[PDB]
Structure 1
Amino acid sequence: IVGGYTCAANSIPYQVSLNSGSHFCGGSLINSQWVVSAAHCYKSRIQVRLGEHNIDVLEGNEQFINAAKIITHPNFNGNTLDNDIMLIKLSSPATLNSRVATVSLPRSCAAAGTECLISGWGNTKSSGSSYPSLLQCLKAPVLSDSSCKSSYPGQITGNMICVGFLEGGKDSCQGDSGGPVVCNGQLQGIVSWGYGCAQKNKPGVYTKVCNYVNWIQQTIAAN
Structure 2
Amino acid sequence: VVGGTEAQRNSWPSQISLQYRSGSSWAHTCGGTLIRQNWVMTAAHCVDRELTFRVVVGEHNLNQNDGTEQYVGVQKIVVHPYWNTDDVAAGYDIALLRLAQSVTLNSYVQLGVLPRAGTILANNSPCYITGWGLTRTNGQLAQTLQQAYLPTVDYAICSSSSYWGSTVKNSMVCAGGDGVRSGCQGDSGGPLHCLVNGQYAVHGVTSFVSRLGCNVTRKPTVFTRVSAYISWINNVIASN
Q: Normalising by structure 1, what TM-score?
A: 0.95
Of 55, 58, 83 in structure 2, the residue corresponding to residue 48 of structure 1 is 55
Report deviation, 1:59: 2.2
CA distance in 2, matches of 1:189, 1:155: 17
Q: Structure 1: state its 5+ residue gaps.
A: none
Residue equivalent to 1:132: 142
Output aligned runs, 1:174-185, within 5 Å.
174-184=185-195, 185=200
Residue equivalent to 1:13: 13
Q: Give the letter aligned to residue 104 of structure 2.
A: T
Residue equivalent to 1:218: 235
Report deviation, 1:157: 2.0
Are residues 1:169 and 2:186 paired? Answer: no
Residues 144-176 of structure 1: per-residue CA shift (max 9 Å, x gap) = 1122112112211221121113x3100000000
Residue equivalent to 1:77: 84
Of 203, 206, 213 in structure 2, the residue corresponding to residue 191 of structure 1 is 206
> Secondary structure at the residue paired with 1:154?
helix
Which shifted more, 153-162 or 55-64? Answer: 153-162
- Two-structure CA RMSD over aligned residues (Å): 1.2
Report deviation, 1:44: 4.2
Residue equivalent to 1:89: 98
> Secondary structure at the residue paired with 1:18?
strand
Report deviation, 1:216: 0.2
> Secondary structure at the residue paired with 2:236?
helix
- 8 Å Cα contact 2:121-2:154 kept in structure 1: no
Q: Give the letter aligned to residue 68 of structure 1.
A: Q
Are residues 1:207 and 2:224 paired? Answer: yes
Q: Normalising by structure 2, what TM-score?
A: 0.89
Of 55, 63, 81 in structure 1, the residue corresponding to residue 70 of structure 2 is 63
Q: Give the letter aligned to residue 222 of structure 2.
A: V
Residues 88-112 of structure 1: per-residue CA shift (max 9 Å, x gap) = 1111111000011011111123222
- 8 Å Cα contact 1:16-1:28 kept in structure 2: yes
Residues 29-79 of structure 1: per-residue CA shift (max 9 Å, x gap) = 011111000000003421000110000112221100011211110110213
Percent identity of equivalent pairs? 39
Aligned length: 221
> Secondary structure at the residue paired with 2:168?
coil
Q: Give the letter aligned to residue 84 of structure 2.
A: N
Of 43, 65, 70 in structure 2, the residue corresponding to residue 38 of structure 1 is 43
CA distance in 1, matches of 2:29, 2:13: 19
